[model samples]
Target: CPVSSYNEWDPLEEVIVGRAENACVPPFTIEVKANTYEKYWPFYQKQGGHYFPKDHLKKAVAEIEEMCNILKTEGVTVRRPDPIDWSLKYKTPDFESTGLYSAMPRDILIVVGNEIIEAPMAWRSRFFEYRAYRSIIKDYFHRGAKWTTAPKPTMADELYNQDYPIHSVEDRHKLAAQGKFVTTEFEPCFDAADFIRAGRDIFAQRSQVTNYLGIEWMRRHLAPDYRVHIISFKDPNPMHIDATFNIIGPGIVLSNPDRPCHQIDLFKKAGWTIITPPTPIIPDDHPLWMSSKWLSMNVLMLDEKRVMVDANEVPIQKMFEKLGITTIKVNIRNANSLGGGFHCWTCDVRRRGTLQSYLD
Candidate 1:
């Protein structure tokens, strides 16, 4: 249930209740906190880094404001969260190397009906476990919900290694088995050397811990409705599944052609319609591959046809346009460097459905 204030004219609850009673399919609105370019302009002061003029941040904010206004005019409500302290999060000496600095905490906003679900804080990026854990708890409350607790499984100890700073792989498996929620795993064991090279990769070592709690939360509360998926490759420096796939709708999905075969097979078997984009294979040293510039894997579907997308994703935008779909593009240039796109920044909880028809 949502808080009292949010319960007023709650569209999401109406839709859920309508479905249960009159078989009604209600339309819901999505909200987002647009990118603030000025917040990230200081990082560009570096010699080899990408540069956006000082005024560019102002321009970016104006652009997003205008975009949100347009959405409002079209009868879709847009909500913006408070501005976060980007400097404090990004000013560390090893910031660039650690992969933590790239996390622009305010990149996306997710709304299901009237409820807003906050993303877990990037603790690994922030290098503080307590802060990250507390952020997750805070967001859960902000969304006005709690996970349903279940019996502690006997295998919980074996599934997760409690010795680590966060949850473990075994922990996630046990949670999943217990009908807890679904979560993607970030395994850093394979390419320890590469992670070592990028001093920040050490954060991945705690993924098992995060995934364990996430899965348990989901299983106990959101089971059977939401499914968890992961996208990974052989390398481990930055193990991100968001870089590999985009969920276009309940069943429609898009992915990088080079994703692991096993993961692809599993998604298909689970009833996901996978759409592999046409991306060129560049040498490992190329900037496009290095920065994942060609990775158009981050997108969020508003309906079957409309989407919120990254501005740099021209090829993907064109591809979807050819299919007669419209796209709302946002500039996430800086945030993309941190391993997320539109979908990574946003999470969807409820959506409208097409009218039902009688079977012959």
Candidate 2:
């Protein structure tokens, strides 16, 4: 079998590094509005469905290709997504849209054992994003890996609450507390980034894109052999769990200080050591188009003792060294503006380890 990975910290044999090729700005739809800061609303409105700034995108593109080479030099197999035109206009029966880049495989793909579950992610632009990955996925399947695409959604009108108030950051907490978000319980729309995996135990969350029904589907799909737990962070605009609570090693995690986990006591009882990473120094003027400075916490573990970290983040580099982990520092400063760190941009295809329970 060409694919089998149980946990995050196992020896990473193979990985899929998402491409920054032909990146596009998703339309400033209700879902996008919910997750993004109000400051960039004008940019989104003007640049929606268009290729990201070409000169800027070129720099970002150049950086990730270098990232691919770096991973290869570290003795890791790196796979890449097929490049597709982001400006191609397509009309679904329900809505018309353009494509977002296939740059975030972690937001769309997950591996549990030998099976790859293509998450029914939550964006209209991502409805058919699977097209960019079929060739690679089939290569795995032909070599003996199981492939499963979860129940898909059409991003129908019903999937979103048109009236989801775009209010202050403080107001978002009140809305989330009221069990409200941009995505309704309509047809199980979710992004794979909302889930985090461990050996035999995976953690999931219902963010603005993911819903209860989506989490339930995952809970049912991997039951008996795998146990799925619903976890939450204090992030009001949460889109991906990796930025909040990343389980990098067995019984260990790099928890973001700003977005503390709500079920943290459970991890504490389970004997998980939660290390808080330093505040990111990505300048306030830096353009992080999608996520917050917490993206610094989204480091990818090459193994339990080695990490692929941001070259610009000196403080966090020392944090890893203090823990005895070797840091393979690389520059993705321009790419960071596109809103994903190493963890969000790559999906582990094969990690060397077996499934086992760490939490009772």
Candidate 3:
């Protein structure tokens, strides 16, 4: 007998897990935390904050809610994290008083083996009591099953010297210089011997890492069963997991054709069957080859046939549709400018299992 209820669908599930035969179905459950745009806007405005507009924030939240409603309609049970003490950190207007603008209510979360892991807040907004918020969410997952936590990478060291308002290229170049910052800084907080050790632990057990960390950690933790393929390029702001690839269904994965070659090689080695987007890039200026503004790479795969992709990613969506995948378009212009999309906004815990033995 197979290890999971979905075992009968092994052939299909294998595609989603890539190389890991003991893959688990993302429980037909998803969790969303409504972006607290309303609460934070006055906070930012009071602090003379600029960059993101309050109206834009409202639109973002409304869109996120709408998307969640769509998922609920699809029979996917959706829940929200208990409201945390947003005032602990979010209520303050340091950005206004000190000119230290920050993006709060961090992005990216995942649930594995019943544990909820989250990407840490960005440097500017690290004041939020992340540890407290994490504790609450972790407990929530524990009610369903075992749980673990993943933290976002630290970029303070890298961005320390750069002028705040600089050219996009310069900014990204600075970010890229902090390659694998999550592995370098945040993983150590887990008390593991090293970043790889910490990564292995998170992947082996049901835990969550940052968006980028999840990809590499999953590949390493589930090694032999799964590997990561990535495209390499020189853009500092390269889209991590959420914007770059998605699992369309049981065992089926889709990717942008413009990913860095190194990234692609990593996944191919891990046993994933790569499906590339059907877009063409100008030679030397190849969309995939350039590390900046790879919009088609960002998307959210709701299931096998349904996806929430950027409105501008029509070519990429058409390609997925050609493969019988359904694409749901969302206005991600705001989120995209901040470096993520749907997948980057939410996390999953307790996916349905394929093999009982793998869990053991």
Candidate 4:
């Protein structure tokens, strides 16, 4: 099959790097408010439904293009999503909003075994993000790849808690501890980035964007052959699991020190090596509008011994070298503002490996 990635550390063969073209700031809805930090709320409130600052976007586009070229130089086949103006307004029966960019394929697509599953994302602005990748998906489908798009959610008012305490981080943490989030159990809504694959075992989180229902849907869909484990962290505003708990190799994971995993014992009990990377050195002045500075840990594996990492994050680069992993460093600081690193910007479509359970 053309789409056959069971884990992250395999020798990568082909990948789909997303486009940063015309990336837009999503509308500052209740759900978006819950996921983003207070510092960026003003920016979102003013720039919602508009293209991201042109100058920043230009640098991002060039960084991604350079990344694609680097991947090609490494002998890995690379593909890209079609560019669409994300500022285009669209309306669904339940909500009306503009589109988000296809800059992070990991947020919308996942490859499990021989099949590629499109996530039914949680946010209203992201509802139509899948349209940008239809052409590439069609090609994969024609070339003997199994494609499955999970049930799309209506994203009605009921999907989110209208009264979510967006103003207080303390209240958000308290609510999260009580098993409550901005996204309720209204439907099975999720982003592909919320789940990380490791052969037959996939780990997921019920974050602000992913609910219990969403995890359950994936659990049922991949049952018997694959196990979906719900793992979480101490994050108050959890969204994607990659920067929080990324599995880089078989039984090897990079655990963010700030957001300690509640289930570290599970991996330790299973004989896994949990490496806590150094704190990111991205300056406070640098803008990370969509994510935390922990994007430094969001590295991509070319194989067990090679990694694609952020060129600017020198400390993390040194750490990878110490682990006997060759660092293929490329600077994507501007692209990082879009909330992804090498791993988030691209989805590995084909990796040189087979399906095998790493955690028994």
Candidate 5:
């Protein structure tokens, strides 16, 4: 009853919503810089490890509250992590760094069937992010949920490509197309957000945060019961797949037109409806410190027939409408700056269904 999710489109029951209350700017580390846009480097350099703009965050606080209210109105149980001071520095024997926000629970926790797995992240500043959800995880464990923590990464210098070039945005894109990333194979590491679940099939990618070893670990760990497939995209600085190639419902996926998936034919041949969302309308004036404009595709499914989407993205909402899926619109533009949309901000704890094949 605590954790039982196998796919993204099942009827959602319980979820854990991340917090922005004491969110802090991640220290400008190698992977952090590689994952962020060059335009925000100055802000990171000047304000690393500090709280975000107080006034903006105050509004974001309200926005998230309203979002939670909407979820409650829709008959979903919302759980939240403890509000901890993210600026508190933590040290591991391998590296030392400050913490980032708990604004992205999807990046740390993934539930496969009845088990919740903790991801081993590669970013130095995010090394201790799992601490934010320990209390919540413990409660679920006490309630009979299976909890598994992927081996904690050392995050030693060898785990990163310190000399990884980032001369221009195009260069970053080029490197991504070449399948090059900031993380080395010295250790296994991944952010749970990179993987998308679809019943018996779970797809993942090797990007700036997730490596081949990490994907292999997940594959081996979930094998015989779950199938994990490695997929590729044309993205230059690939980080999370939700914004690039999201599985919205059974046999239906939302792919970014700008970053086409290399193995799209596989899905097409599997009878999947590949939807290409329109270009995001968010202006250049907005500070998307940690994500791309393609967040328009990063929607969350309330069920096979209802999707939680951006209220401002009317074009994509129309697309969803055409698919016969009702759109539950909510505006989270400011929350997006912290690097998540409806999907990224949440970890679906329980979806009302059991595992079944949708990838034959």
Candidate 6:
């Protein structure tokens, strides 16, 4: 099969690891403002439409290159996106912007069973992110795989809440609680990262970048064969689901302690084992311009008993050890600053398993 991943776990066969080359800072637009931490607002304001600091990007590029090497050594096939200059400005009928890197395939490409779906990204900077993965996807399509591109959003100003109050994390939490977000119901929009797969059940969240319309689009697209459940959390500015409610096995999940899921009881009642990951020990000074420290839990499962995780996150490594999963520790600390950990940096194309319901 060209592309066939039923869920997040299962024996890994082949995968796509993203690139760090020429990663650019997303403009400090309303959507970016809503999702990012206030501390980095000034950074985005100044660095938007530009390649990330050269010294930092060089280290990140080296880190991702080494990570790819590590994956190959683990007996898994690794594919990378073609390098592109994300800083080059482009104009669409609805918007004009530079691009963000193909540094997180998990954010744009997702494989569900035999189909590889490209998400319609919300941010204007990411509107064209799918181009970086088209070559690889085309190869898969030619080799006999189903490829689908969701309806692309116009990304007009109406798609956003321009006055989305983003003063503090406290305010964001309240807004999220009320089902309010920077993205409106103007048109369907989402990033692939907003959904996590677990065989027959796919969990999604309405985040700053994903709206209710987007979730419905996914739900309708994946019809009776797969169930798309809207699961949420107490997150301040929800962006992606992997770091918060990652399903790692048939009935096992790593639930972030900070962002408790609202429908956790449903999982517990379904005979699921919820494991709360330990607090991340990433240094406070580490410049995670795009995500929270909970990246410690955004781990990639090679199989039910094997996980690729951050080498520096020793505490979580010990926790995984106790759970009987052998950890494949590979450090991509510099790449982490670009906004993803192991799971975020890669998209599983094929796993040696069949589609079956885990929620049953």
Question: Arrange candidates by TM-score, highest first: which order?
Answer: 4, 6, 2, 5, 3, 1
lDDT of 4 by residue, 1-360 (tens): 788899999999999999989899999999988877888889999999899899999999899889988999999999889878898888888989998899999999999988999999999999999999999999999999999999999999999999998887577788888879999998899999999999999999989999899999999999989999999789889999999999999999999999999889999999999999999999999889899999999999999999999999999999989989999999899999999899999999999988998886
lDDT of 3 by residue, 151-270 (tens): 434433342333322222344344454443222233322211011111112221111112344355545544564333333444333333333344444434455555333345544655
Candidate 5 Cα deviation (angstroms), residue 248: 1.1
Q: Which is the leading candidate under lDDT? A: 4
Give every collision pair in model 2. none
Candidates by lDDT, descending order: 4, 6, 5, 2, 3, 1
Off by over 4 Å in 4: none
Compare candidates 1 and 5 on TM-score and give the better one.
5
Query: What is the C-alpha local distance difference test score of candidate 6?
Result: 0.91
Q: Which ten residues in a row have the lowest lDDT in candidate 5?
A: 166-175
Candidate 5, residue 133: how far the Cα is off, in Å:
0.9
Candidate 6 residue-wise lDDT, 132-154, digit = tens: 99889999999999999999999
All candidates: CA RMSD in angstroms? 14.1, 1.0, 11.4, 0.8, 1.2, 1.0
State the weakest 10-residue window (summed lDDT) of model 4.
167-176
Which residues of candidate 3, in runs, are more than 4 Å off? Answer: 1-51, 82-108, 119-124, 127-144, 150-234, 245-253, 266-271, 278-296, 310-312, 330-339, 355-360
| Model 2 TM-score (2 dp) | 0.98
Candidate 5 lDDT by residue in tens digits, 1-360:
689999998999999998988778888888888877879899999989899887878877888999899999888999998888888888878877888889999999999999999999888888888988999999999999999999888999999888888645567667667667889899899999999999999999999899999999999999999989999988778887899889988888888898888898898889988988988999889989889877778899999899999999999999889889999999998998888899999999999998899888
The list of candidate 1 runs beyond 4 A from truth reads 1-59, 86-217, 224-235, 238-240, 280-291, 310-312, 329-339, 345-350, 353-360
Candidate 6 lDDT at 148 equals 97
TM-score of each: 0.50, 0.98, 0.55, 0.99, 0.97, 0.98
The reply for model 2, stretches above 4 Å from the true place, is 167-169
